[PDB]
Every structure is written in C-alpha cells, then in structure tokens.
Amino acid sequence: DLGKKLLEAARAGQDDEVRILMANGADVNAKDKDGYTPLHLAAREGHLEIVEVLLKAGADVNAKDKDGYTPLHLAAREGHLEIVEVLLKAGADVNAKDKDGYTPLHLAAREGHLEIVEVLLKAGADVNAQDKFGKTPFDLAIREGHEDIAEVLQKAA
Template sequence: MLLTRIRRGLALAAVVLTLAAASAGAQDQEGPLHVAARNGDAAAIRTLLAKGASVDARDKDGATPLLVATHNNRVEAAKALIDAGADVNAKDRIHDSPYLYAGARGHNEILKMTLAHGADLKSTNRYGGTALIPAAERGLVETVRLLIDAGVDLNHVNRLHWTALLEAIILGNGGAA
C-alpha cells in the first residue's frame, strides 16, 4: 500500500516536472548555446562548441546563436561564434540574419565582423531591403558608411520601390534612431 502511494506520488511528480519543463520550453525553446549567446558568455560558448554543440543550431524562431548574440549586441559572444564558423547570413523565420540585423540596428562591431566573414551584400530582409536601407532610414551614419564602403548597392529598390535615400528622406528624422 505504502509502496503504491510512493509510486503514484513519484509518477505525479514526474508528470508535473515534465509539464513544467514543457511549459518553460514552450516559452524559451533555446538551447544552451542560445542562452550563452543572449547572455554574452563567450567562455560558455567556446566550451559548448568544444563539447559538440552546433554553431548554427536553430531556436523556435529559426534564429541561430549568432543572431541571438547580434540581437543583444553581444560583441564577444558574436566573435566567439564567428570565429567558430557561424554563418553570418543564416536567416530566421522573419528573414533577419546576423549581417542584416547588425546593419539595420547599427551594431557596428558585429557588422564589421560579418562583413569580414562573408556577409552577402545582396541579401535582403523581409521587406526586400538590404542592410543599407534601414540603416539610412534610422540615420545610422557610421553604419551607412560601413555598408557603402563594403559595396552594398546604393540604388537597390525594396518592395515599396524605395532606395536607401528615399527611406532616409521619407521615413527618417534626420538623426540617429
């Protein structure tokens, strides 16, 4: 009798723990490498990669650890991932890549690394724009210079049929975002 109650109690505890883990996973669904990237923990990133973690693993949104690091402007984490061969052009479900996002948000240190490691200058975001278009619209002057110097097409036209100059004039406010 006592043994049966203990077994039932353990079974119930297992179900509760499984549901709690599933609930947390539904919110996060990040692997340890994504967490380390979000937190900027370059040492943990190197350790996880040395233990076999996939440098381009995807989370529930299709983001790689490098994109997560880029979202949070975690330069050292991004460097550790890029040095390990992370794909700077890997796009998530909304068509952001580390290169495109760094350019759009003015994360210039990460942008420089992506440019040095094979950024696809013709790559476009979900709006059909290159990294230059949102950078110009947001008034990110240094970022715009980096992208122009890298060779991004100044006359690329997005889905609205606008160039970076038109976005800057029509949507910009004349200064940094």
C-alpha cells in the same frame, strides 16, 4: 540539446558559457523558433566576442531567420558598428534582402546609423536596392529626415 543552450548563452552574452558549449560540441547553427541562430542573437544584442567566436567556428554568416534577416541585418539595424565590420570581414552578404526586400543598408539608413551606412557602402552595398514598397535606402533616409545619410547615399549612387 547543446544548440538550444548555445542560443540562450549567445543572446544572454554569456561568453564563458558560449566558450564551454562550443568547446563541447554545440551546433553553432542551432535555430530557435523564429529561425535565429546564435550569430543572429549575439549580433542583435551587441555581443562582439561571441559573434567572433561563432564566426571562427564556421557559423553560417548569412543564415536567415523566418523573415529573411541575416545577422548583418540585425547588427546594422541595432547600430552595432564593430559587429557589422566583423560580419562583413567574415563574408556577410552586404546586400542580403529580407522577405520585404530590406537590405542592411535600408535598415541602417532607416535607423540613422551613419557610420554603419558608410561601412556598408564600402563593402559594396547597393544604394539602388528597392524594398517591397519600391523604396531605396535613400528614400528611407529622407522619410526619417536623415540628411547626412541621404547625402552619403546619393554620392555613392
């Protein structure tokens, strides 16, 4: 199964290998046991070239894993700025919620990725989105002391 191979190559950042598999018919929307697609894994790991290749192949940019995470959730959490931007351009739902109501903005704020927070805001991230605990990204920012993020978030309110 070429999908299972594309998943591993995407995670491993094996560009030539990803290239070969897709050039040879690999299912770009292959899912692993946890619902990750190659786009999730590449986005999480920071493999930009692979991300772009998958997107152009029409990979579902808003695919959800078993917990509702989109590739944008992962890139934003991990702090991969270039990947976040590429995902957004490809139509990523910037306000996608996971099973706990976490948006990419929540995750970026929680993690302290200011640059990503700003980029998410420009793409129309909802600063008022609440998670399962009724917390907004602003709340998460205060709860990690991310004051630069807290301020950016409050100005976008």
